[PDB]
């Protein structure tokens, strides 16, 4: 009977989603936890820091996204429920400030 539950991307290979409400749900769940959507994009989604910014700010509809364009949105959809519980516990140790002298 009920057999999957975490809802792997194979559901979304066929069916459509509201990419605007998806990015919304994601942005909220991240904000509710003080997660920088940048580092989420970098690690979880796997995307460049500006590419994911443009994504979450001004997505395209599912109908525009090809399979390679849906990949980050799929990982977004999963992460909502799935949380992708590999591993947590490491910030990016590093920083810089400007200098001129």
Distance from chain centroid for Cα 51: 11
By the 8 A CB rule, do 77 and 67 touch? no
Residues in the chain: 101
Q: Is 3 part of any domain?
A: no
Query: What is the CATH classification number for the domain harbouring 29?
Result: 1.10.260.40
Q: Is 41 part of any domain?
A: yes
CA 40, CA 27: separation in Å to the nearest integer?
Answer: 10
Distance from chain centroid for Cα 82: 12
Count the Cβ atoms, other than its own, within 10 Å of residue 10.
Answer: 10
Q: Give 16-30 as a DSSP string.
A: ---HHHHHHHHHHHH
Q: Which long-range contacts (CB under 8 A, 24 or more apart) does 61-64 make?
A: 61/19, 61/20, 62/16, 62/17, 62/18, 62/19, 63/16
- Region of 7 on the Ramachandran plot (φ > 0 left; ψ -120 to 50 alpha; else beta): left
Give alpha helix (H) positions in the chain: 19-31, 37-39, 49-57, 67-82
Question: Domain residues for 70?
Answer: 17-101
Supply 65's token pair.
Answer: 């996204």
By the 8 A CB rule, do 57 and 21 touch? no
Q: Is 2 part of any domain?
A: no
> According to the entry, how was the structure determined?
NMR
CA 23, CA 37: separation in Å to the nearest integer?
Answer: 11
CA 40, CA 91: separation in Å to the nearest integer?
Answer: 11
Domain count, the chain: 1
Q: Is 6 part of any domain?
A: no
Q: Is 9 part of any domain?
A: no
Q: Is 67 part of any domain?
A: yes
Supply 20's token pair.
Answer: 């605007």
Q: For the purposes of burial, counting CB atoms within 10 Å of the CB of 73, is it exposed (0-12), middle (13-18) or buried (19 or more)? A: buried
């Amino acid at each position: 009977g009920s057999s999957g539950s975490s809802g792997q991307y194979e559901l979304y290979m066929y069916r459509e989603v509201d990419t605007l409400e998806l990015t919304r749900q994601v942005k909220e769940k991240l904000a509710k936890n003080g997660i920088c959507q940048r580092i989420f994009g970098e690690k979880v989604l796997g995307l460049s820091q500006g590419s994911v910014s443009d994504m979450l700010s001004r997505p395209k509809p599912w109908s525009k996204l090809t399979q390679k364009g849906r990949e980050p949105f799929i990982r977004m959809q999963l992460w909502l429920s799935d949380q992708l519980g590999q591993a947590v516990g490491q910030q990016p140790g590093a920083s810089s400030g400007p200098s001129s002298g």
